[PDB]
GROMACS .gro file of C-alpha atoms in nm:
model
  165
    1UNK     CA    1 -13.353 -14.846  21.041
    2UNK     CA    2 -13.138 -15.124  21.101
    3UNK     CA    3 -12.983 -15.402  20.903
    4UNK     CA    4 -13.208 -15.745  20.879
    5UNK     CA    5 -12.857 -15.937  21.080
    6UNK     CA    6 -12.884 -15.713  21.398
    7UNK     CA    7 -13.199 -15.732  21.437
    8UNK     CA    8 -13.162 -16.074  21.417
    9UNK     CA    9 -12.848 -16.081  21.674
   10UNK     CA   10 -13.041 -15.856  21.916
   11UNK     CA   11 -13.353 -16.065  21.886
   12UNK     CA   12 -13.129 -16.385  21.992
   13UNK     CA   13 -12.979 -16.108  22.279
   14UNK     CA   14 -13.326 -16.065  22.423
   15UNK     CA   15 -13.419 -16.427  22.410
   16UNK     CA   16 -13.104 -16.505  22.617
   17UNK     CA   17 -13.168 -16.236  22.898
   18UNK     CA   18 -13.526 -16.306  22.934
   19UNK     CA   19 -13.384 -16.705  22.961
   20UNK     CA   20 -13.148 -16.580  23.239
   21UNK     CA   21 -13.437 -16.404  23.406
   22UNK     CA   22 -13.593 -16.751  23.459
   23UNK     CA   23 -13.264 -16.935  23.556
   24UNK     CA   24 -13.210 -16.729  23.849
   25UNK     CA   25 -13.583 -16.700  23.934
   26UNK     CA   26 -13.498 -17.082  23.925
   27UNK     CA   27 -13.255 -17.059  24.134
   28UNK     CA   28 -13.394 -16.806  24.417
   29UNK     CA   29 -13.712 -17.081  24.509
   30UNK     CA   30 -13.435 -17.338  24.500
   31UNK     CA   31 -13.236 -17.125  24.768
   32UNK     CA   32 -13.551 -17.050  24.984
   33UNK     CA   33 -13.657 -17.422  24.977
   34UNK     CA   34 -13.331 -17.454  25.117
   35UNK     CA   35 -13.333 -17.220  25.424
   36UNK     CA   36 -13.092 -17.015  25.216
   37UNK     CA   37 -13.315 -16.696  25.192
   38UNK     CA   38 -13.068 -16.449  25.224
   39UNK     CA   39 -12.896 -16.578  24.823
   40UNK     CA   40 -13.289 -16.652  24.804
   41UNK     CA   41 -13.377 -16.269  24.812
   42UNK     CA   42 -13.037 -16.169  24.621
   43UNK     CA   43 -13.130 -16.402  24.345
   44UNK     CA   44 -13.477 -16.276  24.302
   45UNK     CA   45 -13.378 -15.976  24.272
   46UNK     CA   46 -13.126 -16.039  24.005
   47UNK     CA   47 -13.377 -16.226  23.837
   48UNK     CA   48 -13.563 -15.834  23.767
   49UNK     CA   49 -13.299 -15.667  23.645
   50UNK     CA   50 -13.195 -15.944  23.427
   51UNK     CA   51 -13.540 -15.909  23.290
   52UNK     CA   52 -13.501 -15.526  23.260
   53UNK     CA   53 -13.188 -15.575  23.058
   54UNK     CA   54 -13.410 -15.764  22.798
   55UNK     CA   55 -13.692 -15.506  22.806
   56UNK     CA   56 -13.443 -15.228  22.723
   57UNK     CA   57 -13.357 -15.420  22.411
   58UNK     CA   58 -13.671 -15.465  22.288
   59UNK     CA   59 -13.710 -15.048  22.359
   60UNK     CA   60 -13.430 -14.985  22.140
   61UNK     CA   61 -13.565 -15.201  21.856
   62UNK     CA   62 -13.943 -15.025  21.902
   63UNK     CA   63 -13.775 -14.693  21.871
   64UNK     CA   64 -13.546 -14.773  21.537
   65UNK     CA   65 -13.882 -14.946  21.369
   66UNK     CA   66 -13.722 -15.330  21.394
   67UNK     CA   67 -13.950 -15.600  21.435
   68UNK     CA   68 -13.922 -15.788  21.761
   69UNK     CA   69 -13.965 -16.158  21.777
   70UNK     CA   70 -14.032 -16.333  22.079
   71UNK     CA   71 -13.923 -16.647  22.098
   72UNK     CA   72 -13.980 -16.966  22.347
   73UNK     CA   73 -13.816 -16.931  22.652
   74UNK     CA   74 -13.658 -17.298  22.742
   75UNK     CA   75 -13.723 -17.446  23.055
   76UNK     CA   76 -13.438 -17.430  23.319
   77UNK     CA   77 -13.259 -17.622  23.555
   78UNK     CA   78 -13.471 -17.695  23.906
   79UNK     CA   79 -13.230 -17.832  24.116
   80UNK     CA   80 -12.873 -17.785  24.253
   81UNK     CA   81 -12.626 -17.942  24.509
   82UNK     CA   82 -12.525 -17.676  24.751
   83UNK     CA   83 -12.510 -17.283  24.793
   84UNK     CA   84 -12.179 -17.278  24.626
   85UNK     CA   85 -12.312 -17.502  24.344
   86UNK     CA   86 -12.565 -17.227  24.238
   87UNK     CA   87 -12.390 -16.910  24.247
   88UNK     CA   88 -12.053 -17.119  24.066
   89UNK     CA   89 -12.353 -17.210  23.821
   90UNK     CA   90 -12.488 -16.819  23.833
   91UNK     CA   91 -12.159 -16.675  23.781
   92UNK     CA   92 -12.060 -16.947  23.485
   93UNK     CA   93 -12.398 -16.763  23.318
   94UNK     CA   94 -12.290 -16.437  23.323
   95UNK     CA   95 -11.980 -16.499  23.190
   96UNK     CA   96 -12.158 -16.670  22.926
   97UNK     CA   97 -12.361 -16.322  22.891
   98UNK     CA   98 -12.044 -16.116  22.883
   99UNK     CA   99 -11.959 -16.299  22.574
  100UNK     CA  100 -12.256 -16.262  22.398
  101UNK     CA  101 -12.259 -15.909  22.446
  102UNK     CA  102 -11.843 -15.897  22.294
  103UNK     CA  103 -11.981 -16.073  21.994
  104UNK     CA  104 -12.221 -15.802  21.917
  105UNK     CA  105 -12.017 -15.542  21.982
  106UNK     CA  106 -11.772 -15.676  21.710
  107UNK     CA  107 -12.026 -15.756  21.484
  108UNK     CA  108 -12.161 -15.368  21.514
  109UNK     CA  109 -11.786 -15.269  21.464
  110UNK     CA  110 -11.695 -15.441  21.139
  111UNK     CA  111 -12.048 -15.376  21.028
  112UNK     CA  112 -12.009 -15.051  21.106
  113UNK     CA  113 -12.336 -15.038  21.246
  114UNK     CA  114 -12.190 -14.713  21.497
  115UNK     CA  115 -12.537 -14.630  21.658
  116UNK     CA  116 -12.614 -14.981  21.805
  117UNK     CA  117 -12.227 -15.006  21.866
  118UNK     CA  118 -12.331 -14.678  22.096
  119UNK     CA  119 -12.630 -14.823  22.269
  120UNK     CA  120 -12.458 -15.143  22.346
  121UNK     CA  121 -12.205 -14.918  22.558
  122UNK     CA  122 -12.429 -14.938  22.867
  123UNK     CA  123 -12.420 -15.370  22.856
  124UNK     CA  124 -12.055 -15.373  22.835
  125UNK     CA  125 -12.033 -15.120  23.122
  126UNK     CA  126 -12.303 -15.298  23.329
  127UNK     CA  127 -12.156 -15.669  23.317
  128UNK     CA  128 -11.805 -15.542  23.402
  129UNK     CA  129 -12.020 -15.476  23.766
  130UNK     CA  130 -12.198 -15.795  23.739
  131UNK     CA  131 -11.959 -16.020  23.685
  132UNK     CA  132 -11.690 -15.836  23.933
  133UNK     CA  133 -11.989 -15.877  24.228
  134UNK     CA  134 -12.077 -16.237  24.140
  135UNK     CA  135 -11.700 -16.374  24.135
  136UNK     CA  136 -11.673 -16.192  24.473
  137UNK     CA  137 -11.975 -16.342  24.607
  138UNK     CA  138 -11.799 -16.745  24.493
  139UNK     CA  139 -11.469 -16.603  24.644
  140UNK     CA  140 -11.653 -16.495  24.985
  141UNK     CA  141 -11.880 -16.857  24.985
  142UNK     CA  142 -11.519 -17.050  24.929
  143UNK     CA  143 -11.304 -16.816  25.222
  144UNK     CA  144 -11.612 -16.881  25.470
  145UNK     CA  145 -11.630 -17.243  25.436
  146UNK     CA  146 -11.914 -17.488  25.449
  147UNK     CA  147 -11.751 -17.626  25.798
  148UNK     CA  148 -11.848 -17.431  26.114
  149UNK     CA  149 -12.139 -17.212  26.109
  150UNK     CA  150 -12.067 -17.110  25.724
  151UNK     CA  151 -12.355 -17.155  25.501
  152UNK     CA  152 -12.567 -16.975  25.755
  153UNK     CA  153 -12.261 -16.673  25.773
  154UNK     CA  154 -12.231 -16.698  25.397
  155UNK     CA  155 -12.589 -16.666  25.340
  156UNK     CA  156 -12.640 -16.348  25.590
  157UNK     CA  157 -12.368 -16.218  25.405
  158UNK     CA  158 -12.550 -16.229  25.066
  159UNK     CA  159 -12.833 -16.091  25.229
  160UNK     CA  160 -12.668 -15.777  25.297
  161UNK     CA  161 -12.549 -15.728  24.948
  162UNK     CA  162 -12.934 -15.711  24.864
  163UNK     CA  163 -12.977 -15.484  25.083
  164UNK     CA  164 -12.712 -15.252  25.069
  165UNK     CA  165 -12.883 -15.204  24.679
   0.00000   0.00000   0.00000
């Protein structure tokens, strides 16, 4: 079994990806209000395997015989200035995310909590990708400009990242 303060920590880990989940859910309707559909189907998208990243945690904790507790998931944000506005905003969150996820890995290190430290391998792994494809999708929105015909180009060029996964 595991010790009462990681369960605890990965409790507060689960509450924080299924709160992601919603953000970008958020943020997808905001996108396709907005004619932006192509960073409105990339979002959505996001918004499922953010919520798979929580339901793997809870797996882990039903197979070690920890009790999960599911918390209230807070409300987020329903509006935002521009295309660039939300995935700045999107990419500030996983960042956010990444950090969580090095604060658990210490704590399982000088805890020496060595299974969990094991597990968590696959998060540390997976948000090195996430954050690399989300600071080149800011990058790309900046280098196309809003001037010319550049939301529309930056959008269709969002759409093919959700397609090309």
């Amino acid at each position: 079994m595991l010790s009462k303060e990681v369960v605890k920590l990965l409790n507060e880990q689960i509450n924080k990806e299924m709160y992601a989940a919603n953000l970008y859910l958020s943020m997808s309707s905001w996108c396709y209000e907005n004619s932006l559909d192509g960073a409105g189907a990339f979002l959505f998208a996001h918004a499922s395997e953010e919520s798979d990243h929580a339901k793997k945690l809870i797996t882990y904790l039903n197979e070690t015989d920890s009790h999960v507790e599911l918390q209230e998931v807070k409300q987020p944000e329903q509006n935002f200035k521009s295309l660039l506005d939300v995935f700045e905003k999107t990419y500030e969150h996983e960042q956010f995310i990444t950090k969580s996820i090095n604060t658990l890995v210490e704590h399982m290190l000088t805890h020496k909590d060595y299974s969990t430290f094991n597990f968590l391998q696959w998060y540390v792994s997976e948000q090195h990708e996430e954050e690399a494809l989300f600071r080149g999708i800011v990058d790309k929105i900046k280098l196309i400009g809003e001037h010319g015909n550049g939301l529309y180009l930056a959008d269709q060029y969002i759409k093919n990242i959700a397609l090309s996964r």
